[PDB]
Design a protein around this ligand. Structure first.
Ligand SMILES: CC(=O)N[C@@H]1[C@@H](O[C@@H]2O[C@@H](C)[C@@H](O)[C@@H](O)[C@@H]2O)[C@H](O[C@@H]2O[C@H](CO)[C@H](O)[C@H](O)[C@H]2O[C@@H]2O[C@@H](C)[C@@H](O)[C@@H](O)[C@@H]2O)[C@@H](CO)O[C@@H]1O
Lengths: 216, 212
């Protein structure tokens, strides 16, 4: 089949930057009728992709003028003239010139913005979950940048490890920040044998670590 | 406006069959070639099939050829995808799409319907409240299979400041996630906050009021 290879696999750029993505086919992609059915798609997390460019350089109805495409033969390029916060997504090239129709592997585009420290919140286990025999303590790191962050749990000042999991949101389409959740899971018994629960947060935007806690 | 709505997605055991449907409106269905495209969890897009508007001209990639069959009912403006001898690799979101007269393939997409090929039984989530300048509150949606789960606040009336985290697999092989929202601390006690959780695979609907 025709392999579509995109470069780079991912990148980050500042708002207002000119971004260029490339797609190269392993073979020529000129349909027998003479057309080059090369298209570019944009996909934001959780949603269906959206057509941006078709037949190499034609902009689909409603697509902002900042998006454009070009190329020929086996090398094509997708360009965003002035990147906006809402452009965070994965972009894919696609060829419909020869069956089987194939897609590029996709290029993840993130936004580079100023460092922003997270707001930290801590949540104790609910009364209804406790009667279930398990306790989940949650720590929320809200709207920060860059993505890298360090969360450490402490029960009665004891360092925890192996009993927590974390999740990070997709970069925000408006403020280009990330949010993170850390969940400490303990048994009802363990939880009820301790009083002070706290999560310590370390991040580029914080001059010193932030700690949030509560007394059972 | 052009509307495409897929349905029929579900949890199925390997080797079994599943039939997907795509109801359309807003355009002359009988004038357009139609497509199905899928996306495995965390992976890219893959063209699955196409069918002429009339004459039943079809084609598929070798990965599904012989197992999948696209069909349509022009009188009902509906497209179908019969999936037989399903394999774990067939897991993913299936999209219905329509191109344009002038040469594009997927100009219009449906929202997609999830298909999970697994030997495991479906399991609904348990929902717990995350009790609360600005204050943070939320809901813990724990122990469910498979994805996806949707979480809204106040039936869609509350969207600003909401963050629903990507689900994370626990050692049990089940997913868990939290959905949080930040609101003015002065609103605590005057405005009600309810997280509406919907796990379509198990048809589990939970409404949890979060109070301070
Ligand atoms: C509205 C409609 O469905 N028209 C079809 C046309 O499909 C349209 O155009 C093609 C190129 C593609 O962009 C479709 O998404 C779009 O709806 C059919 O064209 C064929 O489509 C199939 C499926 O994608 C193949 O791509 C096939 O090669 C296409 O035919 C070629 O392109 C045509 C424009 C002609 O030049 C034909 O000779 C080529 O082989 C056509 C098929 O006859 O039928 C409607 O017009």
């Amino acid at each position: 089949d025709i392999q579509m290879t995109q470069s780079p696999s991912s990148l980050s750029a500042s708002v207002g930057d000119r971004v260029t993505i490339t797609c190269r086919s392993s073979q020529r992609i000129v349909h027998s009728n003479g057309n080059t059915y090369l298209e570019w798609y944009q996909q934001t997390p959780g949603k269906a992709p959206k057509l941006l460019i078709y037949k190499v350089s034609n902009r689909f109805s409603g697509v902002p003028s900042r998006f454009s495409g070009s190329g020929s033969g086996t090398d094509f390029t997708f360009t965003i003239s002035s990147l906006q916060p809402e452009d965070i997504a994965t972009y894919y090239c696609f060829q419909g010139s020869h069956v089987p129709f194939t897609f590029g592997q996709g290029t993840k585009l993130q936004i580079t913005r100023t460092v922003a420290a997270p707001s930290v919140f801590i949540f104790p286990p609910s009364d209804e979950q406790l009667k279930s025999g398990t306790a989940s303590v949650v720590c929320l790191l809200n709207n920060f940048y860059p993505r890298e962050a360090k969360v450490q749990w402490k029960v009665d000042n004891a360092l925890q490890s192996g009993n927590s999991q974390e999740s990070v949101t997709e970069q925000d389409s408006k403020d280009s920040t990330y949010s993170l959740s850390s969940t400490l899971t303990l048994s009802k018994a363990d939880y009820e044998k301790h009083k002070v629960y706290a999560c310590e947060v370390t991040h580029q935007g914080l001059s010193s670590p932030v700690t949030k806690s509560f007394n059972r | 406006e052009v509307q495409l709505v897929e349905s029929g997605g579900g949890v199925v055991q390997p080797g079994r069959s599943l039939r997907l449907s795509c109801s359309t409106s807003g355009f002359t269905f009988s004038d357009y070639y139609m497509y199905w495209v899928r996306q495995a969890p965390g992976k890219g897009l893959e063209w699955v099939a196409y069918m002429s508007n009339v004459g039943a001209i079809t084609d598929y990639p070798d990965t599904v050829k012989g197992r999948f069959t696209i069909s349509r009912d022009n009188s009902k403006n509906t497209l179908f995808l019969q999936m037989d001898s399903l394999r774990p690799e067939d897991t993913g979101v299936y999209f219905c799409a329509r191109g344009t007269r002038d040469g594009s393939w997927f100009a219009y997409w449906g929202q997609g319907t999830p298909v999970t090929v697994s030997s495991a039984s479906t399991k609904g989530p348990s929902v717990f409240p995350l009790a609360p300048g600005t204050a943070a509150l939320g809901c813990l949606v724990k122990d469910y299979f498979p994805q996806p789960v949707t979480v809204s606040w106040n039936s869609g009336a509350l969207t600003s400041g909401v963050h629903t985290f990507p689900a994370v697999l626990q050692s049990s092989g089940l997913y868990s996630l939290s959905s949080v929202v930040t609101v003015p601390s002065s609103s605590l006690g005057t405005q009600t906050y309810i997280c509406n959780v919907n796990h379509k695979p198990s048809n589990t609907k939970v409404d949890k009021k979060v109070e301070p």
